[PDB]
Design an enzyme around this catalytic site. Sequence first.
Site, PDB file in Angstrom:
ATOM      1  N   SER A   3      -4.979  28.902  36.341  1.00 24.01           N
ATOM      2  CA  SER A   3      -4.344  27.596  36.223  1.00 24.01           C
ATOM      3  C   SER A   3      -3.946  27.276  37.677  1.00 24.01           C
ATOM      4  O   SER A   3      -2.996  27.845  38.201  1.00 24.01           O
ATOM      5  CB  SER A   3      -3.125  27.611  35.298  1.00 24.01           C
ATOM      6  N   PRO A   4      -4.750  26.457  38.375  1.00 21.73           N
ATOM      7  CA  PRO A   4      -4.544  26.043  39.761  1.00 21.73           C
ATOM      8  C   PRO A   4      -3.172  25.473  40.141  1.00 21.73           C
ATOM      9  O   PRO A   4      -2.458  24.940  39.297  1.00 21.73           O
ATOM     10  CB  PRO A   4      -5.654  25.012  39.945  1.00 21.73           C
TER      11      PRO A   4
ATOM     12  N   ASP B  61      -6.647  26.240  33.461  1.00 25.37           N
ATOM     13  CA  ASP B  61      -5.476  25.514  32.917  1.00 25.37           C
ATOM     14  C   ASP B  61      -4.947  24.430  33.906  1.00 25.37           C
ATOM     15  O   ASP B  61      -4.689  24.706  35.081  1.00 25.37           O
ATOM     16  CB  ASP B  61      -4.390  26.522  32.491  1.00 25.37           C
TER      17      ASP B  61
HETATM   18  N1  LIG Z   1      -6.262  29.343  47.969  1.00 28.93           N
HETATM   19  C1  LIG Z   1      -5.449  30.141  47.284  1.00 28.93           C
HETATM   20  N2  LIG Z   1      -5.759  31.416  47.094  1.00 28.93           N
HETATM   21  C2  LIG Z   1      -4.950  32.203  46.319  1.00 28.93           C
HETATM   22  N3  LIG Z   1      -3.821  31.907  45.672  1.00 28.93           N
HETATM   23  C3  LIG Z   1      -3.610  30.579  45.946  1.00 28.93           C
HETATM   24  C4  LIG Z   1      -4.362  29.705  46.708  1.00 28.93           C
HETATM   25  N4  LIG Z   1      -3.850  28.459  46.727  1.00 28.93           N
HETATM   26  C5  LIG Z   1      -2.736  28.555  45.955  1.00 28.93           C
HETATM   27  N5  LIG Z   1      -2.531  29.848  45.424  1.00 28.93           N
HETATM   28  C6  LIG Z   1      -1.566  30.315  44.398  1.00 28.93           C
HETATM   29  O1  LIG Z   1      -1.918  29.694  43.110  1.00 28.93           O
HETATM   30  C7  LIG Z   1      -0.872  29.851  42.102  1.00 28.93           C
HETATM   31  C8  LIG Z   1      -0.996  28.783  41.177  1.00 28.93           C
HETATM   32  S1  LIG Z   1       0.240  28.980  39.829  1.00 28.93           S
HETATM   33  C9  LIG Z   1      -0.308  30.571  39.117  1.00 28.93           C
HETATM   34  C10 LIG Z   1       0.481  30.907  37.854  1.00 28.93           C
HETATM   35  C11 LIG Z   1      -0.090  32.101  37.080  1.00 28.93           C
HETATM   36  N6  LIG Z   1      -0.989  31.701  36.056  1.00 28.93           N
HETATM   37  C12 LIG Z   1       1.044  32.957  36.560  1.00 28.93           C
HETATM   38  O2  LIG Z   1       1.402  32.864  35.321  1.00 28.93           O
HETATM   39  O3  LIG Z   1       1.991  33.112  37.428  1.00 28.93           O
HETATM   40  C13 LIG Z   1       0.353  29.680  42.997  1.00 28.93           C
HETATM   41  O4  LIG Z   1       1.217  30.880  43.037  1.00 28.93           O
HETATM   42  C14 LIG Z   1      -0.297  29.531  44.485  1.00 28.93           C
HETATM   43  O5  LIG Z   1       0.565  30.091  45.508  1.00 28.93           O
END
Ligand SMILES: Nc1ncnc2c1ncn2[C@@H]1O[C@H](CSCC[C@H](N)C(=O)O)[C@@H](O)[C@H]1O
Length: 282
Positions: free
Chosen positions: A38-39, A81
């Site tokens: 989920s980006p 997501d």
């Molecule tokens: N290019 C990148 N490579 C790796 N992580 C990245 C990124 N760009 C953003 N992120 C990380 O992407 C996450 C999106 S939110 C992730 C939530 C995860 N599903 C869980 O439940 O915690 C954020 O923490 C962000 O810091």
Amino acid sequence: NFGKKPAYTTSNGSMYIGDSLELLESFPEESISLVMTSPPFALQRKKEYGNLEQHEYVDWFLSFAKVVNKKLKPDGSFVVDFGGAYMKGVPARSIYNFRVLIRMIDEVGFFLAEDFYWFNPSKLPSPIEWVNKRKIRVKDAVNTVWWFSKTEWPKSDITKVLASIPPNLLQISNSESNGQYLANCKLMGIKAHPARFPAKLPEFFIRMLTEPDDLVVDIFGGSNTTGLVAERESRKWISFEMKPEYVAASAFRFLDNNISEEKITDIYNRILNGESLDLNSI
Ligand SMILES: Nc1ncnc2c1ncn2[C@@H]1O[C@H](CSCC[C@H](N)C(=O)O)[C@@H](O)[C@H]1O
């Protein structure tokens, strides 16, 4: 295999700190069975100009989509997501999550195996200005989870997800837990990941599209709920996250109540310091 060393490692997998668009390339090809994420969405993302956040964000994400196509097995799936969003100072919706969809089929060549929808009853991002105050929009409470697949025939078995055949709609809420991650976070005087999803979300897709010992990757790890689930369901996993705080705190998820607070901070700071902890034993 990757160009770095994992922040920490456990029985079935390991989490890395870094940019996933680089790290993905270290995976052989047709090696991943399920990429589940989920980006991070905040007003666009990495891409100069400021042309129409909707388009800039889309391009940014399509880059990852392209590499993920190559690394997924032919029967592999890429479940993503996305949460809805209004535009700045106006009650008109952004349709960035739908633009991603069209260009993923048209330009990247993915297939929408099936469109899923997640109803989170308890959701704070609900924009008070339009809902509570002005009373002109209703609670923004459904997320567009797109199950993409490398071919028209990705690996799937709905009987492992039986309710009674379940529907297109998943009704889950974030906290149906307390857990040690929240407690250990409170311990460090730190805040838990600002936006993370309930364990039941990736559980549903891990159980449905993969079998034990399959590799479940998460390219935006965050608090690593995925790897956590993929662990207790006996799949192999690998997560990438850019922020060290998130990786460090996520490690807590893989420990027990029986651990000195003095050992918790050690684990936290050592990971935050670039060390490679082998969590499988102390
Ligand atoms: N290019 C990148 N490579 C790796 N992580 C990245 C990124 N760009 C953003 N992120 C990380 O992407 C996450 C999106 S939110 C992730 C939530 C995860 N599903 C869980 O439940 O915690 C954020 O923490 C962000 O810091």
